Design a protein around this ligand. Structure first.
Ligand code: NA
Ligand code: NA
Lengths: 95, 95
């Protein structure tokens, strides 16, 4: 199965209709992930208790070879973000 | 740096004070991740546009050996959840 962000936001809106509208639920859901992204972009690890942690990772630069010339190259570094599932999520998935 | 769930919820509360209280911001932030967990527990992939995707993964069972006896064992399967950062997050981290 699948659950999208819009579906998440719709569930928020349905379960918190006393708190906020469907439009605000979508705004806030978008803000959750935007803010998490902003934090990763700022180099922060984002820890979400009961859920897990996000950290920026960097594929390190390293020596390669030009295959044709056997000249030393640099394979460039690049960043990504990694999630490590927390203990509670791991427990819930293994029940 | 670090950003926790409480800090995320506090940012939500600060930036959406017209929408919800600090208490509700924490409730909703907790619900976001609880609901995502519920979806993974239900076997759903959770796709969050602009952010990335979570999927349940299973470390497959496989043959091991009892080291001492050379009897065939089974190393048990276990589930976890994996996140794959979306293109936009990858772009933002590499800017
Ligand atoms: Na609305
Ligand atoms: Na409050």
């Amino acid at each position: 199965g699948h659950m999208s962000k819009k579906e998440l936001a719709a569930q928020i809106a349905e379960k918190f209709t006393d708190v906020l509208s469907k439009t605000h639920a979508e705004e806030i859901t978008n803000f959750v992930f935007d803010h998490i992204k902003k934090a990763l972009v700022a180099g922060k690890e984002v820890s979400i208790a009961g859920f897990g942690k996000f950290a920026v990772t960097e594929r390190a630069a390293r020596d390669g070879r030009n295959p044709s010339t056997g000249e030393t190259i640099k394979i460039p570094a690049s960043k990504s973000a990694k999630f490590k599932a927390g203990k509670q999520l791991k427990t819930d998935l293994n029940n």
